[PDB]
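Interim report, section 4.2 (structural modelling).
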Amino acid sequence: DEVDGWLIIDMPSDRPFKQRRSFADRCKEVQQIRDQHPSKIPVIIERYKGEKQLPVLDKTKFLVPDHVNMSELVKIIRRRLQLNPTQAFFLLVNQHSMVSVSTPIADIYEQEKDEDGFLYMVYASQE
Amino acid sequence: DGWLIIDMPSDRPFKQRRSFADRCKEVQQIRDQHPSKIPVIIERYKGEKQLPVLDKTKFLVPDHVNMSELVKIIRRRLQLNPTQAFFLLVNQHSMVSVSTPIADIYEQEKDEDGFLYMVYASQET
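Predicted structure of the assembly:
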């Protein structure tokens, strides 16, 4: 806890996935994933920056079949966060994109995927 | 005998009711008379049914205000009560923080014709 006179702080890392790996490493990972699972979408789902009433997700990486709509994914987040009904949340795709719950993620992927090939989503409460 | 002629007002977006040349011309006149104001087109999101249509779609906004000011203005014209939540989307689906200055949104998202297009929708949609 103290090394060489220095007092070390051990707080856990809250990095977004994009800040933990390099662009080359993320691209490399997507290609491996799209090779073994060409019928699934690699989705990164993280907590919005300024969120306060909502807890962090324990698992933020999801391999999703092409055919499921956003509803099917929202309810997954509904189950993983185990939220109460009076606490409403929204899911933004990529950077600030509100998309219809009936849209298949396969169209969302090809329209909104990141430069690295991942599809980034964030959940928030309001504002 | 003859024809059944039907006349109904248009609910088509502003971009389809006004030519490109007229829209460009209108912004040019407005930026000349009002160089410190932002011309914003605010319309109801296409598949929206919970919130009504507004009688005014064209808004001349001071360039110094934040997105918050535009939300409060639309909320008032929609006469919403606190239990009614809505979003104001830039372009078609872009969510922006209410603290973002409208001038920054304008220079980043304005249309080629000089207007800034926004739509309002409720969480249901």
